[PDB]
Design a binder for this molecule. Structure first.
Ligand SMILES: NC(=O)[C@H](CCC(=O)O)NC(=O)c1ccc2cc(C(F)(F)P(=O)(O)O)ccc2c1
Length: 297
C-alpha cells in the first residue's frame, strides 16, 4: 500500500534509510565500453556510465559510443532513453541518437548554467534565424517555435538528416526550475509538466523512446521516469495498491546506474505518484488543478 508506506516512513524519518537500502540492492553490470580510453571525452562524469547491456549504440562505424541507456519497462510498456547532458563534442551524437532511435520528444530537466559551470551544452538553436548544423553527424537543427511558461519551456524543433534530406519534428520539453540534487516546486508543477509531455504524443509507442536528460542523466531523469512508470502501472494493474515504487526503481536501475540521487527525490516520487493517482482514478476532470497550482504564468 503506497500512501500507508509514505506516512509510515515520514513519521519515523526513514527516507534516507529506505533510499540507501535501495542503493545497496542496486544492480551492477559492467560498463566496459564506457571506460575504453577512446570514450573518456564522451563521458561527462567518471562515476556515471551506461551499462554495456543497455547502452544506446550510434550507427557509426569507428565509434558507436554515447552515454545513454535504454530503460525498458516491460510491464509498464514504456521505454525511455536516459542520457547525460550533451558535451561540447557530443551534441552531434545526441541528435544522431535522436534520429536513429526515432525519438519524437526530448525532455531536459536541468539548466545549461547550473550554479556556475557547463552542466550541459547548448544543443539546440536559441534563435530561429540561426540554425545549428552538426557537421560530424550530417544533421541540421532549426528552432520553429517556443512556448515559454514560468517553470518550463516547450519548443518545436525541425531535425533534418542532411544525407537523406528527410525532415522531422522534435518536441523539446525543458523543465527550467529543477535544481541538481533538488526536487520540483511541487507535485502539481511536476505533474503538470509530465502530463503536457504525455499529451504531446511524445511518449506514444508509435514513436521511438523519449530521450530524457538532466546533467548526469540519473537524478532528475530518474525521478521523472520513476513517476511516469508508476503512474502507468497504477493505470494498468487490477489494484494500484500493489505498485511498489521501491521495486520499480530497482528494475529501472538494472538499465542505468544511480537513478534517483537523493532520499528527498525518492520521497517526492511517492508524493508525485500519489497525487497523480488521483487524476487517473476518474478525477481527471480537475487536472487543471495542477496547472493553477503550478502557477505556469
Ligand atoms: N567530477 C566527476 O566526474 C565526479 C566523479 C566522482 C567519482 O569519481 O567518485 N562525479 C560528478 O561530478 C557527478 C556525479 C553525479 C552527478 C549527478 C547530478 C544530478 F543528480 F543532479 P543529475 O540529475 O543531473 O543526474 C549532477 C551532477 C553530478 C556530478
Amino acid at each position: 500500500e503506497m500512501e500507508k508506506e509514505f506516512e509510515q516512513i515520514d513519521k519515523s524519518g526513514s527516507w534516507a534509510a529506505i533510499y540507501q537500502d535501495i542503493r545497496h540492492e542496486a544492480s551492477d553490470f559492467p560498463c566496459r565500453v564506457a571506460k575504453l580510453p577512446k570514450n573518456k571525452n564522451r563521458n561527462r562524469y567518471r562515476d556515471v556510465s551506461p551499462f554495456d547491456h543497455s547502452r544506446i549504440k550510434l550507427h557509426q562505424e569507428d565509434n558507436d559510443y554515447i552515454n545513454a541507456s535504454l530503460i525498458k519497462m516491460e510491464e509498464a510498456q514504456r521505454s525511455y532513453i536516459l542520457t547525460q547532458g550533451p558535451l561540447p563534442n557530443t551534441c552531434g551524437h545526441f541528435w544522431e541518437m535522436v534520429w536513429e532511435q526515432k525519438s519524437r520528444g526530448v525532455v531536459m530537466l536541468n539548466r545549461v548554467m547550473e550554479k556556475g559551470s557547463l552542466k550541459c551544452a547548448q544543443y539546440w538553436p536559441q534563435k530561429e534565424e540561426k540554425e545549428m548544423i552538426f557537421e560530424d553527424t550530417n544533421l541540421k537543427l532549426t528552432l520553429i517555435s517556443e512556448d515559454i511558461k514560468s517553470y518550463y519551456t516547450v519548443r518545436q524543433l525541425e531535425l533534418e538528416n542532411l544525407t537523406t534530406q528527410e525532415t522531422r519534428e522534435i518536441l523539446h520539453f525543458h523543465y527550467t526550475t529543477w535544481p541538481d540534487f533538488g526536487v520540483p516546486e511541487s507535485p502539481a508543477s511536476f505533474l503538470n509538466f509530465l502530463f503536457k509531455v504525455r499529451e504531446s504524443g511524445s511518449l506514444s509507442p508509435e514513436h521511438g523512446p523519449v530521450v530524457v536528460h538532466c546533467s548526469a542523466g540519473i537524478g532528475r531523469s530518474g525521478t521523472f521516469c520513476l513517476a511516469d512508470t508508476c503512474l502507468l502501472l497504477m493505470d494498468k494493474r487490477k489494484d494500484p495498491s500493489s505498485v511498489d515504487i521501491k521495486k520499480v526503481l530497482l528494475d529501472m536501475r538494472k538499465f542505468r546506474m544511480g537513478l534517483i540521487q537523493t532520499a528527498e527525490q525518492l520521497r517526492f516520487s511517492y508524493l508525485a505518484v500519489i497525487e497523480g493517482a488521483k487524476f487517473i482514478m476518474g478525477d481527471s476532470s480537475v487536472q487543471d488543478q495542477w496547472k493553477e497550482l503550478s502557477h505556469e504564468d
